[PDB]
Amino acid sequence: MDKSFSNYFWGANDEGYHALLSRFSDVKHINEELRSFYHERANIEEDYAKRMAKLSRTTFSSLETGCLKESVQVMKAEVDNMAKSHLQISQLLQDDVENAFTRYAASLKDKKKMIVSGIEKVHKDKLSKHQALVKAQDKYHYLCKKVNYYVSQQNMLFGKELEKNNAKLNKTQNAITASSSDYQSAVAAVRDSYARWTNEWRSTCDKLQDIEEERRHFLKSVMWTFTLLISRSCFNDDQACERIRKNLEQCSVSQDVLEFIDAKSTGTGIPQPPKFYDYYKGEVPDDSVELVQANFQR
Amino acid sequence: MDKSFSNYFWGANDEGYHALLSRFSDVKHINEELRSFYHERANIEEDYAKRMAKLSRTTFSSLETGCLKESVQVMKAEVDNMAKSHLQISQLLQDDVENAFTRYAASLKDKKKMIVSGIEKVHKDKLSKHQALVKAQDKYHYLCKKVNYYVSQQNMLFGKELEKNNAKLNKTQNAITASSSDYQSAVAAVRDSYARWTNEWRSTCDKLQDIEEERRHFLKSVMWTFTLLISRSCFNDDQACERIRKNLEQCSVSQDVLEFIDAKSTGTGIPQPPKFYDYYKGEVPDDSVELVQANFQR
């Protein structure tokens, strides 16, 4: 005996019928919870991306020089690259994760419509025949019961009331044939309906088991996709960080200081103190600052 | 000739003196710009973490079953772990990156007060001696021009006008010898002051260059730290994703469905159709629902 919905969702009152149908709302509930969860997770990522992009738009002054200035620019460009990545990730979190639940809820609605329709008609007919069977069985039952009574009256009745009784008895006996006939027809019709019901519910159970099995594969894959997206985000950001470090590694402080000196130098000549100007040896005061070239060791 | 601050920041008007001193203001503004940048970056990270922790506090319904139910909890728990990680990272960004500039700013301020202390006095003495020189220089040549006036008017003059003239000539000629010595004394003093200034400014230059070198090593170090922190964040999140994937790998859909069937089964008995009970001969309904156990294949 196989372990499937086909063999384990029956019951004397179609318990499996009402159960598996009502489960559709539980599946929908679970699906909506996760959609809502990942909806927020995506917006969190988007906001993060947006703020990081805004930060990348920061303008610095022109006060820094050399490769150190370049490093700040590279760093800002790479923070921007991280923003772009996170924005792309948030978009995928919405489209491939969040919206996957949305597309599932839309698909499930159609699946339920197709399944519920093609089984509730069969079920309604099953109950319809069964009602007709009980109604027919009852008529035939209490007709036989009246015959029993009318015969028992023959022992104590007399006169015109005995013949009136025997008239009722005779009329009731002739009703038995048709009543028994309609009853047996009701038995036959209910048998066929049950036979059709057994086959149809089996078919429905197979389809309902498919949905459940696909549901669990779906939920696993989406959560899997979620981790793939975040791991990708980590790879991207780490690569950006590595590029910042590579740029920093190539940034020589001593070379920067050299270039700083060349660009900011104010003079290599040391001003000499003013000398004595003897009025008599033709000497005359001048303003030309004598310069002696600096020649110190660091 | 070494390429150092000590050899390249002179100039006839002490341009290098004023340039390297106002340099402190630029260095401070660069540091503040970066501090502000990483403050926002740390802030973005903190908001990210806080919002992600709030999300992981979501409560899901207990409608889900099996390993899948466990996987959803593992997923949400690892989302929680990522939030905690991003929170600590934001704290380290604040204390080790952002606050690094704050610690540097304090040390730079106290360092500046010492450089400015030991050089501004020396510079004023240079300017003070120079003012004393130009004043003595002017007095000397003004007297020389005046002795020259009375001399050129000698032969042109006569008697009592000559005597009045020559009297002012003697008084002036006398003063010239004295002012010439004061002029020379000033020249001697100024050359001493310029010598001290030269030796002191080169010393200060060497210190200022140490500061500039220190500064560039510092900013690179803090940027480096920034990348290590983000990379560490990437690592933690990726590990969290791995752990989620380890759990999904071990979760079996088949087993979940098998356990679902076991828990939710509503019966294995197929209800059989009601039979015809010949009431007319005393055949009484056995109101039992005959159950033929299902044996369908999947």
| Contacts A193 to B, Cβ<8 Å | 273
Q: How far is CA B251 from CA A96, A213, A220, B240, B262, in A?
A: 22, 13, 9, 17, 18
Contact at 8 Å (CB) between B74 and B243? yes
| Contacts A148 to B, Cβ<8 Å | none
Map residue A289 onto helix, strand or coil.
coil
Contact at 8 Å (CB) between B55 and A37? yes
User: Amino acid identity, residue B112?
Assistant: K
| Contacts A241 to B, Cβ<8 Å | 227-228, 230-231, 234
Rg (CA), chain A: 48
Contact at 8 Å (CB) between B189 and B60? no
Map residue A292 onto helix, strand or coil.
strand
Q: Could you tell me which of B55, B51, B89 has the C-alpha nearest to residue B75?
A: B55
Q: Could you tell me which of A270, A265, A252 has the C-alpha nearest to residue B3?
A: A265
Q: What are phi and psi of B27, to 5 degrees?
A: -55, -40
Residue B78 to residue B240: CA distance in whole angstroms: 6
Q: Could you tell me which of A194, A192, A181, A200 has the C-alpha nearest to residue A143?
A: A181
| Contacts B282 to A, Cβ<8 Å | none
- What's the farthest any 2 CA atoms get from each other in chain B? 188
Structure tokens at A111: 């699946």
* Beta strand ranges found along B25-172 (DSSP E): none
Please state whether beta strands A269-271 and A291-293 pair in parallel, antiparallel, or not at all (unpaired): antiparallel
Residue A164, judged by CB atoms within 10 A of its CB (0-12, 13-18, 19+), counts as: exposed
Helices B15-55 and B66-92: crossing angle in degrees, nearest 10, is 160
Q: Could you tell me which of A188, A185, A183, A191 has the C-alpha nearest to residue A137?
A: A183
Interface of B with A in 23-82 (CB under 8 A): 26, 29-30, 33-34, 37, 40-41, 44, 47-48, 51-52, 55, 58, 60-61, 63-64, 68, 71-72, 75-76, 79, 82
CB contact under 8 A, B11 and A271: yes
Structure tokens at A125: 């007919």
Residue B251 to residue A166: CA distance in whole angstroms: 78
Structure tokens at B144: 């020389």
Task: Count CA atoms within 13 Å of residue A159 on its CB side.
Answer: 2
> For the stretch A131-163, what's the b/e string if a residue is b when 16 or more beta carbons lie within 10 angstroms of its beta carbon?
ebbeebbebbbebbebbeebeeeeeeeeeeeee
Residue B265 to residue A210: CA distance in whole angstroms: 16
Method for structure elucidation = X-ray
DSSP letter for B268, please: S
* CA distance between the termini of chain A: 94
Q: Could you tell me which of B283, B271, B286, B273 has the C-alpha nearest to residue A140?
A: B283
Structure tokens at B141: 């040549």
User: Amino acid identity, residue A281?
Assistant: K
CB contact under 8 A, A6 and B275: no
Q: Is A185 on the interface with B (CB under 8 A)?
A: no
By C-alpha distance, the chain A residue nearest B239 is: A231
Q: Is B204 on the interface with A (CB under 8 A)?
A: no
Helices B99-152 and B15-55: crossing angle in degrees, nearest 10, is 160
> Hey, how many other C-beta atoms are within 10 angstroms of the C-beta on A80?
16
Q: Is B243 on the interface with A (CB under 8 A)?
A: no
Residue B291 to residue B257: CA distance in whole angstroms: 25
* Separation of CA B217 from chain center: 13
Rg (CA), chain B: 48
The domain limits of chain B are 1-266
- What's the farthest any 2 CA atoms get from each other in chain A? 186
DSSP letter for A246, please: H
* Separation of CA B268 from chain center: 72
Q: Which residue bears the tokens 């500064």? A: B215
B2, B47, B267 ranked by CB distance to A11: nearest: B267
CB contact under 8 A, B296 and A230: no
| Contacts B61 to A, Cβ<8 Å | 29-30, 33
Q: Which residue bears the tokens 């660069």? A: B30
Contact at 8 Å (CB) between A266 and B15? yes
Q: Could you tell me which of B28, B188, B203 has the C-alpha nearest to residue B102?
A: B28
Helices B159-250 and B99-152: crossing angle in degrees, nearest 10, is 170
Q: Is B292 on the interface with A (CB under 8 A)?
A: no
Q: Residue B292: in which H helix or E strand, if any?
A: strand B291-293
Residue B264, judged by CB atoms within 10 A of its CB (0-12, 13-18, 19+), counts as: middle
Structure tokens at B263: 């828990």
Structure tokens at A197: 């019901």
Long-range interactions of B271-274: CB distance < 8 A, separation 24+: B271/A10, B271/A11, B271/A12, B271/A14, B271/A194, B272/A194, B273/A187, B273/A190, B273/A191, B273/A193, B273/A194, B273/A195, B274/A130, B274/A133, B274/A137, B274/A187, B274/A190
Residue A130 to residue A138: CA distance in whole angstroms: 12
Residues paired with B270 in a beta bridge = B292
Contacts of residue A146, defined as CB under 8 A and 6 or more positions apart, other chains included, come to A168, A172
| Contacts A47 to B, Cβ<8 Å | 47, 51
Q: Is B142 on the interface with A (CB under 8 A)?
A: no
| Contacts B244 to A, Cβ<8 Å | 223, 226-227
CA angle in degrees (0–180, nearest 5) for B281-B284-B286: 150
Expressed in Å, this structure's resolution amounts to: 2.4
By C-alpha distance, the chain B residue nearest A173 is: B280
DSSP letter for B59, please: -
